[PDB]
């Protein structure tokens, strides 16, 4: 056969008769307008096809032509800075072509521009007749000033070079490489086609050792994440699950950034592409905007529900491809709970039996096959480069309830879990990461990095997590039996933990001094507030009974100027770098002398 | 007793959904067969047979149905049950989910072919577990010590360090010299696979471990035939090669979750919370393959780790496990928040074979009474601690001095300390020293006399 015929439509799914030689997960095009669909089930002569666009007006007598290929992206230059939908069609070309403000629901816009020309240069001793394998760099293309899009071979094939293009400007459809095999001399180009449901082959995985500097104070200190790690950000509506995701895409220590909007708002992707081209960052003393390193996969809630499956798998396929260049890729999935609602709506039409709360039984296998594609890993190919993929997947639980089959299947896979709280957003405590229920399992793996650069921070967080731990048990005390009967070793605990909750954990992301703090500033103000609790420990412990001693109202009325240096320590904007370490020891020296005074 | 007729090859699939492939026109199909799906791309996938009906047979492929056509695939019927190639050489190597090697090695040379379902033991000729295994953990050997041959899970929750106390009872696995660990990893990450693969080569113990692994990358149908194929090599080394094994299945909850996907795709009538009705029996045939026979010298003990969803012991995975096994080890969340390693809660954890693995002949005279008394002051101490937050007796602060000293000094022992049982009872008696002689009700005076003043 070469095409099919629709037999019945019901929402997103499409049953198509006269379709025998079609495999599972093919890419067919149903309708007179050729809506792009994928086969998800077939029973004998018919196939059941989910459709990545809105089925409306699709009749029974419509043709369904099949292509014999899975859902695949086009990987090559022209992919950074642009904005795509779930099936990788560029949203900037699709409005400069049709001149409208809508997506015309039938257009086959090429995923990469076959008209713009990039300056190619070969990989500098790639000789003719040299042996070449699958996945090594045979040329460099400078897409922007920041990113050198290293052209690679597909991982399937390999051979001996017969022709390489001379250094110059080429299209994305020009033949650049021809390789001889046993049978056939095979042509190539600058683009490659890879199926999004198949994991990219790679040499051997490596342990993760370098941390992901997100810039937040509570995130980098208590629950750190490494590049090559998996992270989940749950929390109810209005908690700020995306302002941590937009703080990751602006100020991370990552080479490229790929932001995936899966069932997101339409204004939240327009918020991204507006304020990014004025945020210039430096790498080698040169400033350029972060839109050179950010690629948006935009699939809003208005856009159809079967395409939410594709926008997650596309954005991790671009993230796996840029990993093969050696770049330390990051990925912000936003949000995977709207992806799991696409699995429920599709399986509802197929009469599948549900698991707990509506979702299908394979929900734990789709999330595991997506989160486990992250991790720093020595790539394929001869130039011997080590890349990474770090997945930060936002989760939107309904009603703020973490006993949910999306979240409970997520936490068995992710290592870091930044549990946001809804009570911490009524009081304007931003970021709202609940420091009790949140955890990270990167800590034992990260102190080896800490015993090289910042050699005092592991005993710091052990006491910083402890003072927040003892505050929670004593908060239930003072709300029942009152604060009047409290001890003096515990009333100092209730103040410095309240001093942590407005200095350290609170962080106004829109001011010039707390929109991104480095790690020396974060370890700086924590090395003082813990030393303040350690010094005020001795003021009660050693002179406990004998002398008419410090009852700490002595301290709170006399040391108010040093506490004002602590309560305003966070105000060091990035115009001072070496001064902040001096002021950290200067405000310590004000704290050093007053135990004698 | 070998078969020699040439195998048929059916090119007549007629339906595929999820992990299932439905065949037609099959001539005399057999239940629980093994097949070989040859894809049009030349890929080879295997599969059991879930249900025959006349000329139909619905197979479940292991490596997923992605790519299977309706006319070009060919499914070749092997005329027997899935029989794994087992050998003594399956020791010191690393295998994937179903049966293939990982460390660039050979396929095994098949000393004998054994059924992965096993065959049921005679309950009359099964000797009782009496010899006590010293795990080194004070929270186990002090309170709920495990005997050789005893099946006993570690009830964890998601996020808790259950893998670091899984490898802790590998290095400190010994009696109070051929302790061949058989490991089975189901639904683990790569960063948890590196924590188990590179912690058996660190102690040099990789000359006796048979680490299986089934990562989250690998498909979910292979999780079903992992503990049936990891036990039947452990059943070979312990009943046919007279070697003491210890099998540590991992993440039983994930093994169940793979059972739910096949059950929901089969459209069977389900049980509690989506799991199939037969999960009690399905978790019984991979749990009851433990203990030791009376005719041989070997033994097989089972420590199957499982995480409970949302810290719930009433979930069907820890519920049916506590009805098949012989008591649990409940590593808790709140003790982990107080930075205890291992964070084992000693109140719901239990061992039904601690009563017959302790005493004057086995370990020492005071094991039976210090384990009841440390349990007594911990259980009475908890409800008075709840009234403490919301006084009234000077002996109530004695019980809260027990709670402050129990969690910090007894159960907390660090990641590399191996307390022997002779060292364990001395630290347990020091906790009862803060209580008077009269307040220890469940210790008789004949055992309280010579042990309390020291």
């Amino acid at each position: 056969s070469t095409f099919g015929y629709v037999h019945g439509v019901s929402g997103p799914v499409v049953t198509a008769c006269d379709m025998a030689g079609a495999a599972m997960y093919e890419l067919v095009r149903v309708g007179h307008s050729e809506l792009v669909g994928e086969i998800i089930r077939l029973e004998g002569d018919m196939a059941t096809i989910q459709v990545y666009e809105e089925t409306s007006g699709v009749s029974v007598g419509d043709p369904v032509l099949r292509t014999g290929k899975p859902l695949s992206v086009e990987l090559g230059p022209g992919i950074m800075g642009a904005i795509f939908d779930g099936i990788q069609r560029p949203l900037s070309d699709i409005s400069s072509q049709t001149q409208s403000i809508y997506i015309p629901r039938g257009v086959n816009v090429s995923a990469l521009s076959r008209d713009v020309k990039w300056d190619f240069t070969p990989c500098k001793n790639l000789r003719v007749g040299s042996h070449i394998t699958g996945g090594d760099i045979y040329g460099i293309v400078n897409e922007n000033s920041l990113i050198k899009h290293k052209i690679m071979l597909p991982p399937r094939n390999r051979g001996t070079v017969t022709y390489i293009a001379p250094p110059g400007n080429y299209d994305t459809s020009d033949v650049v490489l021809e390789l001889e095999f046993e049978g056939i001399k095979e042509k190539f180009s600058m683009v490659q086609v890879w199926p999004v449901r198949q994991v990219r082959p790679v040499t051997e995985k490596l342990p993760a050792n370098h941390p992901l500097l997100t810039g937040q104070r509570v995130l980098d200190a208590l629950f750190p994440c490494v590049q090559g790690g998996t992270t989940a950000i749950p929390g109810a509506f209005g908690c700020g699950k995306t302002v941590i995701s937009q703080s990751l895409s602006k100020y991370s220590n990552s080479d490229v950034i790929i932001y995936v909007g899966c069932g997101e708002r339409g204004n939240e992707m327009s918020e991204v592409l507006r304020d990014f081209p004025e945020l210039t960052m430096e790498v080698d003393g040169k400033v350029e905007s972060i839109m050179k390193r950010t690629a948006l996969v935009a699939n809003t809630s208005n856009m159809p529900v079967a395409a939410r499956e594709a926008s997650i798998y596309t954005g991790i396929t671009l993230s796996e491809y840029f990993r093969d260049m050696g770049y330390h890729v990051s990925m912000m999935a936003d949000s995977t709970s709207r992806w799991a609602e696409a699995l429920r709506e599709i399986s509802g039409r197929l009469a599948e039996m549900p698991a707990d709360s509506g979702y299908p039984a394979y929900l734990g296998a789709r999330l595991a096959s997506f989160y486990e594609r992250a991790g720093r890993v020595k790539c394929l190919g001869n130039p011997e480069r080590e890349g990474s993929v770090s997945i930060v997947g936002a989760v939107s639980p309904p009603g703020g309830d973490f006993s949910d089959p999306v979240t409970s299947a997520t936490l068995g896979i992710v290592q870091v879990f930044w549990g946001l709280d809804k009570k911490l957003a009524q009081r304007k405590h931003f970021p709202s990461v609940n420091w009790l229920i949140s955890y990270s399992k990167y800590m034992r793996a990260l102190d080896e990095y800490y015993d090289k650069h910042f050699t005092e921070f592991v005993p710091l967080r052990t006491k910083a997590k402890e003072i927040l731990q003892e505050e929670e048990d004593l908060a239930e005390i003072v709300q029942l039996v009152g604060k009047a009967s409290l001890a003096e070793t515990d009333k100092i605990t209730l103040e410095v933990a309240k001093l942590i909750k407005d200095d350290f954990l609170q962080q106004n992301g829109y001011t010039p001094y707390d929109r991104f703090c480095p790690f020396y500033k974060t370890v700086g103000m924590l090395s003082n507030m813990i030393a303040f609790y350690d010094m005020a420990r001795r003021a009660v412990e050693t002179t406990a009974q004998s002398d008419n001693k410090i009852t700490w109202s002595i301290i709170r009325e006399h040391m108010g100027e040093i506490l004002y240096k602590l309560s305003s320590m966070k105000f060091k904007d990035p115009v001072k770098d070496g001064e902040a370490k001096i002021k950290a020891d200067y405000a310590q020296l004000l704290e050093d002398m007053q135990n004698a005074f | 007793n070998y078969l020699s007729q040439p195998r048929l090859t059916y090119k007549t699939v007629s339906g595929v959904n999820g992990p299932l492939v439905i065949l037609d026109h099959v001539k005399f199909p057999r239940y629980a067969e093994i097949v070989h799906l040859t894809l049009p791309d030349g890929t080879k996938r295997s599969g059991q047979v879930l249900e025959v009906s006349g000329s139909k047979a619905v197979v479940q492929v292991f490596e997923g149905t992605s790519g299977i056509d309706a006319k070009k695939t060919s499914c070749e019927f092997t005329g027997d049950i899935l029989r794994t190639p087992v050998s003594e050489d399956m020791l010191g190597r690393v295998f994937n989910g179903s049966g293939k090697p990982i460390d660039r090695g050979p396929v095994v040379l098949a000393e004998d072919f054994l059924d992965i379902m096993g065959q049921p033991i005679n309950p009359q000729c099964r000797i009782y577990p009496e010899e006590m295994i010293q795990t080194g953990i004070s929270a186990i050997d002090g309170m709920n010590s495990i005997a050789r041959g005893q099946k006993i899970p570690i009830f964890s929750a998601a996020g808790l360090p259950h893998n670091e106390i899984a490898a802790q009872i590998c290095r400190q696995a010994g009696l109070v010299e051929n302790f061949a660990i058989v490991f089975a990893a189901m639904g683990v990450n790569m960063e948890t696979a590196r924590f188990f693969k590179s912690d058996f080569e660190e102690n040099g113990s990789m000359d006796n471990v048979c680490l299986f692994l089934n990562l989250a990358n690998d498909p979910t149908i292979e999780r079903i035939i992992t503990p049936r194929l990891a036990l039947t090599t452990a059943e070979f080394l312990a009943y046919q090669c007279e070697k003491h094994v210890l099998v540590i299945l991992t993440d039983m909850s994930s093994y169940a979750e793979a059972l739910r996907e096949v059950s929901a795709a089969r459209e069977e009538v389900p049980g509690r919370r989506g799991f199939p009705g037969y999960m009690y029996t399905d978790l019984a045939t991979i749990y009851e393959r433990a203990g030791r026979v009376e005719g041989r010298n070997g033994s097989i003990t089972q420590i199957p780790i499982l995480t409970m969803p949302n810290d719930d012991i009433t979930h069907p995975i820890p519920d049916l496990t506590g009805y098949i096994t012989e008591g649990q080890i409940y590593v808790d969340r709140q003790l982990h928040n107080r930075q205890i390693y291992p964070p084992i809660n000693v109140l719901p954890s239990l061992s039904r074979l601690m009563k017959s693995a302790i005493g004057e002949g086995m370990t020492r005279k005071d094991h039976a009474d210090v384990s009841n008394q440390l349990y007594a002051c911990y259980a009475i101490g908890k409800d008075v601690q709840a009234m403490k937050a919301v006084a009234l007796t000077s002996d109530d602060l004695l019980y809260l001095e027990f709670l402050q000293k129990f969690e910090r000094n007894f159960i907390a022992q660090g990641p590399y300390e191996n307390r022997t049982v002779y060292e364990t009872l001395d630290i347990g008696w020091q906790l009862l020293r803060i209580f008077p002689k009269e307040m220890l009700k469940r210790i008789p005076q004949s055992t309280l006399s010579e042990f309390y003043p020291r």
Binding site: A351, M353, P354 | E267, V269, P270, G274
Partner: peptide
């Protein structure tokens, strides 16, 4: 009530396929 009613409809569709 959704899982049991799904089987009640699938016991009828399987019945009329036999009839």
């Amino acid at each position: 009530f959704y899982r049991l009613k799904k089987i009640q409809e699938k016991k009828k569709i399987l019945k009329e396929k036999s009839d």
